[model samples]
Target chain A: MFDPAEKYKMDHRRRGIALIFNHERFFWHLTLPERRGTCADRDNLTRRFSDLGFEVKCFNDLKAEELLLKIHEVSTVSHADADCFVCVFLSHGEGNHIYAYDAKIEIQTLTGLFKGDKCHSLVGKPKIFIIQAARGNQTNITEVDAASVYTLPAGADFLMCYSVAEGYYSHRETVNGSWYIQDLCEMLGKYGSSLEFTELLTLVNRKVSQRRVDFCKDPSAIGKKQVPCFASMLTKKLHFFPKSNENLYFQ
Target chain B: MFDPAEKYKMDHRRRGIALIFNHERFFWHLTLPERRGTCADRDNLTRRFSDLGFEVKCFNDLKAEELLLKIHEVSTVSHADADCFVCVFLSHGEGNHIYAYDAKIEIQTLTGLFKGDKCHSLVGKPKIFIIQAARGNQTNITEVDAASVYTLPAGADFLMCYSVAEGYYSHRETVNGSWYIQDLCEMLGKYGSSLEFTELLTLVNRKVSQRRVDFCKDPSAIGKKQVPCFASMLTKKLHFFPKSNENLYFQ
Candidate 1:
């Protein structure tokens, strides 16, 4: 017996938007170098997720205001006719913010725009974000005793997939792209429709963690490694159900 | 169709140690207030995990060195017969470190003591760390181009359960215990024998997020909320198979 409560409904009229924010150049004041290999990451993700049925959109090198406006614009539109949402960021970062070419952007500021209260039409729908902090980590929470107002605990149904765990830097091949995105795309290509998403992520974890980045050109950076991690608040099984599996998804 | 690669092997002679590092009093110098509700958190976890057949060991208020030494001692032991490892931390935290009564300790230092390279006997087994932060988050890795030596990227096979997500505070009741654990124990008691652990955590996430703590005494802290989150590198379906289900586990 298939249980409706155990899985997200994937039979909407259409799979939702796959927004790819690819940042390659940076402002001089920020002192961050160009993300040389992220183009490969962006293209791979766009193609891979498109194959999974997303309406892929890519934006490059927007000023902070422009980027925010664009994302906020997407957030404001009705997702009532859509099945789910996906956003991928390929950028540089520190702590809880990712660079937006000109300034650091708090990840929550972008993702929370689609919270159930803020984006009612998308409420209860899966809002998946893949962050290749090319980085950083959100929630609005107040204290029981503390005095200050807190940030938003991310609304339910968000799955944050990070290319690297917190406090550690990620890996990028000047040619092949990031180790995390590469393995993630491979797994998605192989099982995006058939396998449970988290189980797919675990396979990516095994493949990424087993990799040793000793072959890179940086002398001091040789022998380094990367392991991708995800913060999941999904309430049901998330499968990127293919056109073939919609019947099975609702079987 | 039992695929050994998709699940952790959990049929060892023993279920392994469940270490509960329970913190209550904090040193005056650290200026951290006492976590009033944590003892309830400790007792409930001890009772719940014990029922699931772990050798539960609770340590209270150990100084930094003492805590590290005790954990290191346990990590070095050969776990050839044990199925898995669990370490639960109840404390205050900031950045990537957790408080140990008198001082802050890097979480990586504590967890990496059992990494495959460090604890050979536990390689390929699950290393589960449940953080109540009472509070913080782990991992070791260097960068490809960055200059500084990076922190640990937490070894593979670890599932980190945070009472709250990053950049957010957690909710703890003075009497009922923290929201995350109270719900976690309830779910464990209800489904520990058959439900997958990640699925159980999702249930906890849903329950905790749906809860709003508006009735608290603090005027400024009212309407607070919490959403428990888990970072999983788990490469398998983790089921705390009851003694009755052992046949299903191994079949």
Candidate 2:
């Protein structure tokens, strides 16, 4: 409904921050067989951020110690000059914990390092994270039914988009690819500039629904939902791409 | 909560099939280059899917024709023998349509290719698509004093976990990475194998909330709720990782 250029001018030009971690291998005894999963899609995420004009830093396959070290390094340098900091980990894991080549790395181990006081670089900016893995083993697929319905509060900035929701199974194409990554990348590529983070997710929701309705109903696999979690620490509108005249824009 | 093995299973072994498309070095042309907003986080996403053990086909900065060809190749493949097909595009776009290298491509052009009779490979299986971009630009960032809340309907399946919602702005890290992708990968790595997709997404929501709650009250970006979208075409429960009855081997 809005002119693309007007929106772009309004949203672009914000010097922000981003970080991505694609863990291809895991050291956990349970996930010992390397290549059981792959980390091919994340190869270019860093480049994408760089294109957006960010001072991008990417880490591929870091062990628990290494991940912690990187977090520390970033935190040490992220004191008051950086616009934002993003961290991504793609590896073997189980509910709230990621595996660092044999060790269960609790998510907090890394997130906890970015306290407001400890990491001042992003204190007033938006600190965002996007995850694509799963949580627990409770895949109760039998409770799924179908009806035309939508339920979610709508509006504004600050969102946490996911590949899939909790307690539902997330699938990938053995012959094709990962559902979460494919859909996410495609949608973003197409609409990255025009829509807000949440609305774009809605289209993604539509796409996901169209593909999985009434078919492949597993009694043990319930429908999946990708809900965003937000924790805004800023007092201003923190936009990844803010408008030029908007007060939220840094000048 | 679910067990690791029972929660995040390899897609290759699942009964449902998948179709994967990887877009590397995607290109887009904007009338005004400076007006060009942030590009999609394609590279990181491509890698994420590859790690999930998919037979990935990557295209780097292809022309519109090439992009369509790749999609055709995926759609033409036998979904009867496979479970689903996933197509990822890393390009510039406005909401409702994606750019095939600066050339606006309608969202339908790509999605339309896999309609009911077009791509029979996934006649009954879930044909999932996860988009990580924005839709159109229709955001209102003015501060308001009201919380918008809604409940999800029953029988949900098709879903979208966007990096940002419509109108409202989406934040990308200047250094770390895209907020949506970072959180997405983190959650998937830790809980992917042991939790249902929805449960995983819930965790993603939590992470987002924890990260952005403080900033949500901004007058310019206030009162806006950002929730992912879920639309269902599913007839039954879809489990990314199904449970096995024999429980043991845990310390």
Candidate 3:
């Protein structure tokens, strides 16, 4: 019987880099009242990663050019010293892509820059990208919210997770909160460092589904559900939190 | 260079299993004003798989005995057919285990039911189990959410994608939804029918991290981040969706 605790007890020694992009002021699709709250989601996430021992860096209200440059620059610096690289982009997007303020960039274009050969400094390490944006047509639906767990790749790994899937609507509260973000926070608070990476994400998926509903009257759209996408090129098992005392093995 | 579109085109074969659990049920938690919702995440998820061309069966609100019996029945039935197996649980859990309604069932107990030697029917096939439960104590706020991707093993492809890692909070909302499920649905919607299973999961991870976060703040209590854990025993890369029809031969 595979004991998660036993496996997690193994030693892990690696530094991580986290990047957060909150395009606050640059884009506003909803009314002033809708976008009134602080961009606390981004802040909380940054702190979350920081708490996990990552050297965190965040950028708010950045333009397309700025995002591109900053991403590249961070990758260059972090790639050299860190064992893993994580980048978060909070903006608008379409299928298979995300927006950097006014400009739309394919998720690949940005992630591709960190390829093993491209970002040789971070070669053989995990390169993770988290995207918070909407794709496809929008809708106003009540939805369920849930939590999740996840891990980093032992080798070169690149991933992109979204708020909602393509051709569907992503729900948010009239009061300063996004359904996806809220569920995520709840899960992390409960199991951030104890579970594996994929496990945590699955919880987030379930929580979100339970909390919201696709109240769209249209029969064709009434049952629409939101899900995230994942892609990777990793070589080893990844854990967010290594078991206590196992750190000795890494050193 | 990896072209995801090219790699994932025409590969919509429904393979393996996905399990989702919601342990913290408000209905079960409190007899407040009035309980209005159902613990149907499992039902909805099974149906979703059925729609995706899977021969799906569901087990809801099962106790330890019931849960064990279902596993035995499924194994007996799968002895003749079915290439893979999936089991999801959504309920309150402690580190390394989940609650089966009123009973505490170690996550390993359920997963052990599907081992290669014990269940010869699934030998050499992917046995994927997704858990949406909590593990470890959350009061300790020093740990952060950090993780990486992992590759499967040889010949015995088995994977466990947890909703949250140990020592993190599992997010839940009366509205909005679960973080992991939302990303999962989005991934399936945008690329489930098109991308390789691994690629799809990676994207799911990215979306969860970038978009989801705790809306409120308690510096002492950091918001949890979504992460996934994988334990694969497959000899080769398995794709839920494959580009078998591309037919182009490399010179």
Give the proportion of true interface contacts each model preserves, from 0 to 1.
0.48, 0.11, 0.00
TM-score of each: 0.82, 0.41, 0.44
TM-score of chain B of 3: 0.69
What TM-score would candidate 3 get against the native? Answer: 0.44
**What root-mean-square deviation over C-alphas does model 2 reach?**
22.0
How big is the positional error of residue B24 in model 1, measured in Å on the Cα after superposition? 2.8
Could you say which candidate leads in lDDT? 1
Model 3 DockQ (Cα-based): 0.02
Candidate 3 docking quality: incorrect, acceptable, medium or high:
incorrect
Each predicted complex: what DockQ?
Answer: 0.28, 0.06, 0.02
Better of 1 and 3 by lDDT: 1
Cα displacement (angstroms), candidate 2, residue A8, comes to 14
Candidate 2, B179-205: lDDT as tens digits: 555676676566655544544554554
The number of the candidate with the highest DockQ is 1
Task: Please provide, for model 3 over A1-251, each residue's C-alpha lDDT reduced to its tens digit, 9 standing for 90 to 100.
Answer: 41212221123354567888776454454221122222766766766776666777888767778888988886566445456777877665554456565566766667777866677876656666765565322233333222111222222354444555323355544344566666666666667777545445545655554453456544564655544433333433456673354435422
After superposing candidate 2 on the true structure, give the runs of residues whose Cα lies further than 4 Å from its correct spot: A1-16, A32-37, A79-81, A135-159, A174-176, A213-238, A242-251, B1-251
- What is the Å distance of residue B96 in model 3 from its true position? 39
Model 1 DockQ vs. reference: 0.28
Q: What is the TM-score of chain A alone in each candidate?
A: 0.85, 0.66, 0.72
TM-score of chain B of each: 0.86, 0.64, 0.69
